Design a binder for this molecule. Structure first.
Ligand SMILES: Nc1ncnc2c1ncn2[C@@H]1O[C@H](CSCC[C@H](N)C(=O)O)[C@@H](O)[C@H]1O
Ligand SMILES: Nc1ncnc2c1ncn2[C@@H]1O[C@H](CSCC[C@H](N)C(=O)O)[C@@H](O)[C@H]1O
Ligand SMILES: O=C(O)c1cc2ccccc2[nH]1
Ligand SMILES: O=C(O)c1cc2ccccc2[nH]1
Ligand code: SF4
Ligand code: SF4
Ligand SMILES: [Br-]
Ligand SMILES: [Br-]
Ligand SMILES: [Br-]
Ligand SMILES: [Br-]
Ligand SMILES: [Br-]
Ligand SMILES: [Br-]
Ligand code: NA
Ligand code: NA
Lengths: 384, 384
């Protein structure tokens, strides 16, 4: 019943039977005969199909989707963490980080800033991942309170990204919400390759909670077992060298979640500067756009999430492939009325490329002709 | 400005100058010329004054105090702990304990049971003490929420006992309450003798948070620095062999807190059976009654707390020395409507001696002629 990693050699054999040109000729309602992971790999490796042409086909295949875009702003509630992800500044071994923690007052104030001054109705809560069971349960309790508080304030969509979750931890968080509340669980596998995953997330049975590959990857299945609906798998582009392997696994994961009746967003965040302890791979824009295009095309009902990790010039090019736009800063309680968000190197998880305030980014998108759901521009008679 | 442990040899010299008979002849308003710790030691060691006579004088000296008694019921919100107190079953090294954690639903349900079925308006929240800063802050957040939730439900008095607290941890808890809310910080020093304290609470700089004697003992001073009022020091009778040393220090601590304008309760809980890793001292009833009498007499405005650690027959004898009566069970979420509270050895901190439900214990006290404030007997037109 739980998700099982596909064997790449099997998907390769099926990809060899896919007619990629006939796939591109499909109407926006119809589905290929082969599996989505196999179709995705075939489109990726057929270089007679240009990346630009692949992106155009993906945007058209997702063009009927309504709403075209909705938004959420990240709110890091703390930068404490018990794990040791080597590409992340919040790793416990990073003794240079200034550790911060948002209480009841600060979380509420940040939510009111985002709601009233940035005009957003979507928010995402983030934490580290913690080792001992009591800390994990206490973390689930606080984030559950934050989700309930956001929903009561009028937030229409709430993401959370707080590490892997077991059944009893989901129970604690779940007591704050209802099974039909608009709440999305985010658990990015980062890499679906166990060797690259272990290289960056560390070795198991050593008090490093994220090193357990299997507890992490089945978190969505525990979430769905409890009766919830919205999920968000992800791949950290730049860890594993073989991008074709990650797109097969991510599409396979999305396809498994869809078969369970889940609504899934798909995230492929690209690496950003951080206080790392291991080098990462720089993925060019053409590979990255081709990756997004192949995922968006094969999974047309699963929105890609695009964030301000990417610079403004890249957002202009890739926004048509996305179904979710997420501007903000990965710093603890960084927002302030009328000021751009803080992204202090001393306390942030990484350095974003676009620090413009969300209401400007989202307002420029709307001014360009794409409405953004869960964004209420605080202009005119809506100002206050 | 912080509390300083008195040197026992100095208090001994002053105690030698105290006229114990003239002390007993003092009117209930007047105060001895010597220090309270010195008067307490003198009364303790003057065996020409019987314990029964000492208890009679203490009850009369506290007889004018109004209300004569108020009550609170303990609610252990979890039995996880990072420390290693050798007389406590919740010590981390006790791998036989079944660890439990109360979420939003369970805490609320327990509060409603105590309010509506037991008729109490006082509650105390308890946890373990935790090592890493994030866990301590997350614990302060949850307990702060529980305090606010209890007050909003109509609880007129809330204790908390969650270990030592630093300034930033008090800030997190404090964001849930106001500076004039009826909230009492409980931090029992257990033993004021550093050698006995280290023997039972462990050695410092080893990840055992309660081993830091000094952080614990100045917690009340941080609480008062933040502008709060109600505090509750305590001695665990049965750790240190020399009871005269502990009464000097506890009375000295209460006197320091009084000089800072604080309202203080004084707790001298007696040892109870537990999954210990070190033997404790059995203190007889006569020594214990003499201890309570000397503390109650010298600190007449600071209520002694009497709990269901003590059997019914002892409560009958010592209740006149107390200003607070606290019935309940040291098990996680143990209360159930119409049933006696659970005290399961597999999950409790220790085994209480009186498991009768609080509304029976408190109702029998009231039937005997002592009203109990913050107790609303659910009988008659107040039933349902
Ligand atoms: N240096 C970096 N640059 C860009 N994205 C990063 C990054 N470091 C981590 N991320 C991404 O940010 C995401 C959420 S922040 C991590 C949340 C949680 N502690 C967890 O580990 O699950 C991670 O899943 C990761 O994919
Ligand atoms: N075995 C036992 N019998 C009777 N009382 C005990 C006991 N073990 C601990 N206690 C008392 O119960 C009190 C509150 S329970 C401890 C709360 C918190 N974890 C802390 O250590 O501060 C302790 O201060 C201790 O004095
Ligand atoms: O990536 C996410 O899902 C989430 C975290 C985050 C960080 C930076 C910008 C947007 C963000 N949203
Ligand atoms: O001792 C306390 O202050 C508090 C904990 C506790 C345990 C058992 C009975 C009453 C209690 N109250
Ligand atoms: S990615 Fe998440 S779990 Fe890993 S070090 Fe960063 S905050 Fe911790
Ligand atoms: S007395 Fe408190 S800190 Fe010590 S082991 Fe027990 S619960 Fe933990
Ligand atoms: Br639209
Ligand atoms: Br980078
Ligand atoms: Br909206
Ligand atoms: Br009275
Ligand atoms: Br005992
Ligand atoms: Br009352
Ligand atoms: Na809009
Ligand atoms: Na009463």
């Amino acid at each position: 019943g739980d998700f099982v990693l596909p064997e790449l050699e099997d998907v390769r054999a099926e990809a060899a039977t896919v007619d990629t040109r006939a796939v591109l000729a499909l109407a926006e309602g119809e589905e290929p005969a082969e599996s989505r992971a196999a179709v995705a790999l075939a489109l990726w490796e057929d270089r007679s199909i240009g990346t630009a042409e692949l992106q155009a086909a993906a945007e058209a295949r997702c063009g009927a989707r309504r709403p075209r875009l909705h938004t959420f702003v990240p709110l890091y509630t703390t930068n404490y963490c018990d794990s040791e992800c080597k590409m992340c500044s919040m790793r416990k071994g990073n003794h240079r980080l200034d550790r911060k923690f948002s209480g009841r007052k600060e979380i509420t104030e940040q939510l009111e800033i985002l709601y009233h001054h940035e005009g957003v109705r979507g928010v995402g809560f983030l934490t580290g991942e913690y080792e001992d069971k009591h800390t994990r349960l206490a973390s689930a309790f606080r984030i559950g309170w934050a989700i309930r508080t956001a929903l009561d304030l009028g937030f229409e969509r709430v993401y959370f990204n707080i590490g892997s979750m077991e059944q009893d931890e989901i129970d604690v968080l779940g007591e704050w919400i209802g099974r039909e509340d608009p709440v999305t669980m985010c658990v990015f596998q980062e890499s679906y390759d166990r060797e690259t995953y272990r290289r960056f997330m560390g070795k198991t049975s050593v008090g490093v909670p994220k090193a357990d590959f299997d507890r992490r990857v089945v978190s969505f299945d525990r979430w769905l077992d409890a009766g919830y609906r919205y999920v968000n798998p992800g791949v950290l582009v730049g860890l594993h060298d073989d991008l074709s392997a990650e797109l097969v696994s991510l599409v396979a994961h999305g396809d498994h979640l869809r078969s369970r009746g889940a609504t899934a967003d798909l995230s492929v965040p690209r690496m950003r500067p951080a206080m790392k302890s291991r080098d990462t791979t720089r993925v060019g824009d053409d590979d990255y756009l081709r990756l997004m295009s192949v995922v968006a095309f094969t999974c047309p009902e699963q929105r890609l999430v695009l964030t301000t990790r990417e610079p403004q010039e890249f957002q202009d090019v890739a926004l048509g492939l996305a179904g979710v736009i997420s501007p903000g800063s990965p710093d603890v309680a960084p927002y302030r009325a009328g000021c751009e968000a803080r992204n202090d190197e001393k306390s942030s998880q990484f350095l974003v490329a676009d620090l413009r305030r969300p209401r400007h980014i989202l307002g420029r998108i709307e001014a360009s002709g794409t409405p953004v759901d869960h964004f209420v521009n605080p202009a005119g008679e809506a100002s206050r």
